[PDB]
Amino acid sequence: MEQKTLQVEGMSCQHCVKAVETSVGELDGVSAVHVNLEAGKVDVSFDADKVSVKDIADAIEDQGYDVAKIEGR
C-alpha cells in the first residue's frame, strides 16, 4: 500500500497516457493511478507486497515502454 511515482518518459504520440495507466490499473493490488506524464508525474498507489513496484513497471512494459522507475519513496 505505497503511494509512489513510476516516473514515465513520454515516448509515443497520444495513446500512451492511458496505456501507462491501464497497465498498472489492471493489477488487483493497485489502489490509485494518477497518470500525468505530461506533468512529469504519475501518482500510483499500489500494493508493493503482492506486486512490487518492479512488477508494476514491468506491467507497463507488457503494453507500453514508458516507465523510467520509482522516483521517490
Domains of the chain, each with CATH number or no CATH: 1-73 (3.30.70.100)
CA 50 to chain centre: 16
CA 63 to chain centre: 11
Q: Is 13 annotated as a binding residue?
A: yes
- Tell me which long-range contacts 24-29 makes (C-beta under 8 A, separation of at least 24): 24/56, 24/59, 24/60, 26/59, 27/51, 27/55, 27/56, 27/59
The experimental technique used to determine this model is: NMR
Q: Is 10 annotated as a binding residue?
A: no
